[PDB]
A paper describes a structure:
In this paper, we report a third X-ray crystallographic structure of the PR8 [name] ED containing the [name] mutation. The novel crystal form of PR8 [name] ED ([name]) shows the α/β fold common to all structures of [name] ED. The introduction of a [name] mutation into the ED induces a monomeric phenotype and, intriguingly, two crystal structures of the PR8 [name] ED containing this mutation also exhibit this strand–strand interface. Therefore, since the PR8 [name] ED [name] mutant is monomeric in vitro, it appears highly likely that the helix–helix dimer is the predominant interface for ED homodimerization.
The effector domain (ED) of the influenza virus virulence factor [name] is capable of interaction with a variety of cellular and viral targets, although regulation of these events is poorly understood.
Numbering used by the authors: 86 to 203
The structure:
Amino acid sequence: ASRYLTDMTLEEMSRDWSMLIPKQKVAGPLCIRMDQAIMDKNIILKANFSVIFDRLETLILLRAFTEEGAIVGEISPLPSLPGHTAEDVKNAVGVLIGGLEANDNTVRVSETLQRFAW
């Protein structure tokens, strides 16, 4: 069976959020959203991945959170749910990290993503 390993709580994954200054970029099979208003924060990237054979397979959802718990960024598969490679995920994360860091934020990633990184 396909299972799911996530850094996020049920509430964190379900929450609706608005960006103060919306930015949305599509990069291949993945959508990247980030709030252009956010600056000088410590941000943590948290992800939910499907798992098969005890290995991380596809990204279901990634959200970027301030330490206080506010969502400031998101990566999700396109609605067509095209399906993607690990390289697609790594590219989309780099794009999000780049944008956030350009706005003077400090970005770190979860243990789940660290592991995925290689």
